[PDB]
Design a protein around this ligand. Structure first.
Ligand code: PRO
Ligand code: PRO
Ligand SMILES: [Mn+2]
Ligand SMILES: [Mn+2]
Ligand SMILES: [Mn+2]
Ligand SMILES: [Mn+2]
Ligand SMILES: [O-]
Ligand SMILES: [O-]
Lengths: 483, 484
């Protein structure tokens, strides 16, 4: 069967991947007692956009649910699936003659049928007529709430849809639940995105020099991923935090745009992940700008390495993800006590939520077509109302096929530290004279992507992690030399 | 005063640039009979967005009118300008405490005042109160139609604006007319974006090898522009057309995504331009993939080079831009005849609109904060209803301070050639036995950015252009002398 491929050494992704997703979705809907025979899933693809009211085109990236089901890269499409038979129909825009001048070849419907291995291809302007002839009982459309953005996913619509019976409640929970469990074909793509992004992280560690701007490494990373990996997009805006900016969790956005000069003595926290054919990677490396950990940097770093490997060591089916978050909290507190930043009973520190002062984010999240993938909080799964834990993007138990990030960190964040020092229940644990030395340290995050297996996990990421590995990598003389 | 700067060798852009733009806008408004005393210009900045319903953030790029007036990089702002005094007030988001954890320092209003050199800074939720206290006669908001996209620019709104008198017709043509004429400070930025993008094009010509994917050069271009120029964005999606793809004017979008392997004997047409602090560049270089022009490639290429230099040499204040387009058409037809592709009377070819078969787009467009800059078709200026010319993004006369692209091209586009061959009014000019050799050739576009000056033009772009220069650049020399 056909494959998506960007040539060179890039991954061939079989279009059978998306056919399998459609089949799995149908199989799940068929078991839902509320789904009527003769139902048809109706999805609307993303459309071309421009910047504001300008005619400056925005590079099109497909909507994630549509991509999961069809793998279609072109804007302006719809796709439907007959639930009972699994038959798929792709609807493509009927393009004007001038498209040939400005945009490229006007491909035939047969070209698209062969390209995407769907059962049928029609034009978008025929969708009402085509669906009518199929005499569906009900159209199943996609509407629901993303539990990370809080946004409502907008359901498909077309001229004439009002003439049909439409249900917009059944589909969203079902397709989300399919996306949560990755197929072997999807795992092959996530192995690849992690391979290329890991290589890119290594090249960045080799390239970093005191005096560079943070964004020079953002640029280098994205250049490696695109030129060598075929990754035209990143999975999220690159986070290239040096010095105190490494305490800012999502540093790098337009308001803080990776524009600091890296200085001797800084820690770097680089959270970057290329995207291939709308599949994510999400990796963070932490390391000294000058290639040599100081004693304080080694201590903080190895604390996070300890929680990282303890969590990965414990992860297996049936483990409750909030228990892993609490395990990381406890290890951080133990290590910060060993360092002298903390004193007293770690049990009591845990009871006072002191861990969240140092790690004010969730331990990790589902990953897939989106970096913060869907399905973390389905109906019946509640958010835990405690510092740190309330930022968890899922409170589920682990099962095979789930893909998770494992991303403990320790940060020295002034407003959180100051709050803790004002609270007698927490201040007694904090040694002010030692902590003072760590003001402006930034932080350390060690982020791996893993897959839950029957007996444990599979690690997808492959970057240097021990202090020795990191220092060796940064001192390496050799491979990637743009102009 | 303060400047925008991304360090290293990047350009320091004084915030005074935006102060001057506000001043110029007020000066224009004070002369406008539709404008009464006590008016306040109210602009709304862009907001941050995410991909579809996901929480994947999209990198924020400021809305172009707002950028022109204020130079503000942060999402969620508004900005107002008192027309009579010129006093500027920036409104910034009142951020949640958690911003300090996730996004960075919660800067003070004073920080933004110093940063942007405005007269006052307030929080966005206070805009109704602050405007009420000023007792304005009317709020002037921005609404109009972009003549390239057809889109309606959406006016500012805030909770309570219905309590004010609002006019949404006066401002748009006036701010557009200011934008058409670049200040010396703006020209400094456009010289810089052309400098960096030119360097990047030269690095690309040096790096191109048979066997590479088109997108490898897209990547390399953008990497040069960001790491060396501080250009986080491109001005438009890179067009890296090799072989027959060079006939596709805006190749490289998601449906044709720069994914062809470059072959020996191919021509390349690379239209790429980095953006710095929301100022554009727009440059096209055409060259043989293997570094050596064939006789056929040299002939097509030098035809476009001739029209490029003819137009640049003719441009000056008072010139009607459609006359430059017709000049390019005539030169292309002459040179296609000199190559044996066409025969007969060039006067007759022109009369038959044959030029548009080979150049089915406008000769060039205004450039500024947007690659297709505003103001090409103000009220009164009409689109010419002919092939090629109707695609012109302006039919204005040239004046000092305008910034234009000059981008003639010749392409071999099958459905257009076949239309001509089926049309008795055009078919006899075409020599099939010679044209057949150019089927699948793709095309050549040579695109320069220029400023209209009192005496003619200032060429901003600095890339190799002659056959000799290009071959040398690709051989690693980079080496050449610009048009003057
Ligand atoms: O947003 C999240 O969930 C993770 C936490 C640290 C950075 N990214
Ligand atoms: O869009 C335009 O006007 C120019 C013509 C060739 C490519 N870009
Ligand atoms: Mn991350
Ligand atoms: Mn993550
Ligand atoms: Mn161009
Ligand atoms: Mn142009
Ligand atoms: O992350
Ligand atoms: O262009």
């Amino acid at each position: 069967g056909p494959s998506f491929w960007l040539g060179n050494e890039t991954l061939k992704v079989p279009l059978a991947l998306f056919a399998l997703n459609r089949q799995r979705l149908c199989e799940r809907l068929r078991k839902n007692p509320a789904v009527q025979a003769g139902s048809i899933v109706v999805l609307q693809g993303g459309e071309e956009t421009q910047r504001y009211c300008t005619d400056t085109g925005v590079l099109f990236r497909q909507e994630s649910f549509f991509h999961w089901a069809f793998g279609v890269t072109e804007p302006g499409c719809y796709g439907v699936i007959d639930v009972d038979t699994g038959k798929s129909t792709l609807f493509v825009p009927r393009l004007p003659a001038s498209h040939a001048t400005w945009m490229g070849k006007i491909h035939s419907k047969e070209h698209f049928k062969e390209k995407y291995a769907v059962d049928d291809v029609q034009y978008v302007d025929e969708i009402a007529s085509v669906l009518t002839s199929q005499k569906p009982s009900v159209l199943l459309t996609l509407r629901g709430v993303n539990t990370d953005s809080g946004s409502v996913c907008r359901e498909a619509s077309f001229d004439g849809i009002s003439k049909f019976e439409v249900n917009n409640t059944i589909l969203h929970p079902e397709i989300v639940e399919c996306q949560v469990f990755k197929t072997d074909m999807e795992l092959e793509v996530l192995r690849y995105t992690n391979k290329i992004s890991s290589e890119a992280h290594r090249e960045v560690m080799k390239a970093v020099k005191v005096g560079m701007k943070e964004y020079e490494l953002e640029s280098l990373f994205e250049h490696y991923c695109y030129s060598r990996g075929g990754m035209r997009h990143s999975s999220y805006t690159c986070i290239c935090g040096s010095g105190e900016n490494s305490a800012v969790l999502h540093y790098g956005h337009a308001g803080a745009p990776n524009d600091r000069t890296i200085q001797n003595g800084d820690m770097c926290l680089f959270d970057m992940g290329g995207e291939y054919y709308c599949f994510a990677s999400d990796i963070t490396c932490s390391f000294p700008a000058n290639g040599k950990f100081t004693a304080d940097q080694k201590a903080v770093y190895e604390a996070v390495l300890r929680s990282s490997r303890a969590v990965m060591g414990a992860m297996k089916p049936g483990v409750w993800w909030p228990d892993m978050h609490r395990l990381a909290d406890r290890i951080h507190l133990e290590e910060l006590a060993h360092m002298g930043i903390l004193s007293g009973s770690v049990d009591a520190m845990v009871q006072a939520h002191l861990g969240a002062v140092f790690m004010p984010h969730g331990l990790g999240h589902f990953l897939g077509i989106d970096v913060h993938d869907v399905g973390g909080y389905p109906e019946g799964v509640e958010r835990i109302d405690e510092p740190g834990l309330r930022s968890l993007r899922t409170a589920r138990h682990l099962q095979p096929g789930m893909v998770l990030t494992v991303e403990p960190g320790i940060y020295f964040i002034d407003h959180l530290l100051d709050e803790a020092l004002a609270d007698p229940a927490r201040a007694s644990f904090l040694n002010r004279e030692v902590l003072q030395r760590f003001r402006g340290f930034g932080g350390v995050r060690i982020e791996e992507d893993v897959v839950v297996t029957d007996s444990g996990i599979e690690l997808l990421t492959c970057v240097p992690r021990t202090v020795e590995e990191i220092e060796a990598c940064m001192a390496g003389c050799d491979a990637f030399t743009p102009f």
